[PDB]
Subunit: 278 residues, 3 copies
């Protein structure tokens, strides 16, 4: 009457293997949910021959700018303060309404930044704020990726608001030269898009005002816009769980368990033979 016992015994292999099968599909499902929740990042650096001329959206307001001078040389030659002119920018002043507020027009000024990173070209601006009641001399600016696109785009009055919302506006101080070493990051969201963001590393250098040494003491600002490295750090969140390399593995495990059940039927046959031997 204990033959059905041996039957359920040989079937215990089926039972345990179906149990580990449902356990494994559960674990694989929950791990796929996890790896689908938050993907994995991946950085790659693509060295570029020469950058596309960025757009420096300075917001001087009242402070008139003195000079512009690109300098392929690693060092900007000796300047002469308080003297306007010497401008050699492809500058363009453009107005728009702050998308944050729409309550105050923020006059701007656009500059074609440096292009030749290997030649180490660098825009060197100069500004002046003849004494006012600001109490903190600061001219904030902004960087978008390619200046020619701004020149050619239609209704750039709105393209500028799009930039101001996309990028971030960090100010350069007043009273010392701020060597801004720009650098790009072409980050790619997974929804088939490419987002260009500027990450810069300022380095302020104090201005020795002993050269003018006068009674005017008018505030004057200095900037240097440079390309940090000839590379473009582009980061894209890689989806580490595709719907294919997981179902194939689940099928492989299901087949492993099926083959194991077949080997278990073979082992039950061997055990029946051994019992017949006894």
């Amino acid at each position: 009457c204990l033959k059905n016992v041996f039957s359920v015994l040989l079937i215990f292999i089926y039972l345990l293997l179906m149990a580990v099968a449902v356990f494994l599909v559960y674990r694989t499902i929950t791990d796929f949910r996890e790896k689908l929740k938050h993907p994995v990042m991946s950085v790659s650096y693509k060295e570029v021959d020469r950058y596309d001329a960025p757009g420096i959206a300075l917001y001087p307001g009242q402070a008139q700018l003195l000079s512009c001078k690109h300098h392929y040389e690693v060092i900007p030659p000796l300047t002469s303060p308080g003297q306007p002119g010497d401008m050699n920018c492809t500058t363009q002043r453009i107005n728009y309404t702050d998308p944050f507020s729409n309550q105050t027009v923020k006059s701007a000024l656009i500059v074609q930044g440096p292009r030749e990173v290997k030649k180490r070209e660098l825009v060197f601006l100069q500004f002046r704020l003849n004494k006012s009641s600001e109490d903190f001399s600061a001219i904030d600016y902004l960087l978008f990726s390619s200046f020619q696109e701004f020149l050619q785009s239609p209704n750039r009055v709105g393209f500028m608001q799009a930039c101001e919302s996309a990028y971030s506006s960090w100010k350069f101080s007043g009273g010392f030269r701020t060597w801004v070493k720009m650098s790009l990051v072409k980050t790619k969201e997974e929804d088939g898009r490419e987002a260009v963001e500027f990450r810069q590393e300022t380095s302020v250098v104090n201005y020795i005002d002993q050269r003018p040494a006068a009674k005017k003491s008018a505030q004057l600002f200095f900037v240097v816009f440079e390309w940090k490295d000839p590379f473009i750090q582009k980061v894209q969140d890689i989806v580490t769980a595709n719907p294919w390399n997981t179902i194939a593995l689940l099928c492989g495990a299901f087949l492993a368990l099926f083959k194991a059940a077949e080997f278990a039927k073979l082992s039950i046959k061997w055990m029946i033979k051994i019992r017949k031997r006894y």
Copy 2:
């Protein structure tokens, strides 16, 4: 007498397949050891409606602070130097012993930072150090994540040492306004923990001292504490090698090799038939 030769020939399939099997399990084992050694990082940005009020653990020492003023406006209105008062902080001065030393009590001061990032709220502090022998005016500070937790926690005298050991204490200078744009990173170690770290980007703005223009020339410090972006960069090291999606693949490869050995037995049968045909 050369039949055993054909036998060992048909068995050479078994031999080579068992060899590639041990090679593949070796490679999979060593790759699992590697991917278990150092996991893969993964960044995700979770935009928050409004931040939990951080805790600014300034260490003024002797320098009394003049004013506090939150400013939902993007710009702090014009200040008046040398004049105390106007404080509207939920400030709290707290003492403790430096866990690094335990040899000197470091008087502190806690401030409830800004909360509404979308409203662009910003704490604007002011300090004074009437002329002393410091030779370098610097007031270091510290940031922990949520101020109300500090208020409610028990024995915050030790919670502060825990913070000082966990976070990092970077000083803001003296003589110009330092626009500190705080930002959080809720990093998650894999051992079921969540670590909150502050990564800020200062931006100093020189102070035009021509407004006081007196013979006192007392050192005075300005700060601005702001939330950089409404996002919270949270990074978690994803374990790229789970103990399951590797053993399933090993079993799939073992079955591929078993099926290949079966097809090889079939090919040996075909070769025996071809030999019988000849």
Copy 3:
């Protein structure tokens, strides 16, 4: 005459499964090409007992340096400006030709940085530039990983050019103390190499010149070189697609499809039996 119809019907399982097989190998091939294009990054922090003494390649030019003083104390004690001496560096002045130009010899100066991060040792330099026509007082520097290697290496005149090309040269300003908190990143390119890069976070602190308060007003520079954290952020791009864990999965899927074709032959047998029943 419609028996061949049932034949092609049972064969439609073979057809659809071979179709999904070629589709799956196509998808796996293209995903392997993708994951081979750009690998996945992975950060790990290895706390070190004590750092290997870095090499600070300052480029003073004409500015003679006043003093050196390591300070295990977290704060450098009160200095005395304008007074040379007090040097306790293992300094070494070395010349070479700028690999960028080869048109101008750039005199340098090497300093053995701090070693004991847990002891919070910190090099504190001092410089002077008696009034000149620079108009912007800046002394740029440079960091390589281990100073003893520089001392022992052969023909360091070229090792220095190698460093200048490998690392990046960021200047510390003139007129205020720049607390440079160095930190290493031992990044590993996949081609069996280990690249050591310095990523530092400066923090300038204004110099109160009321202590000299003379008519000389000579430019003088202050630096502090410190180790930020006792950790060494080492990042290595993990190849997320190995040539092995993909072919094993492809074989597992091929076997899943073979077993499915066998079950389909069984289903065709069941359908033939059902048709015979009718």
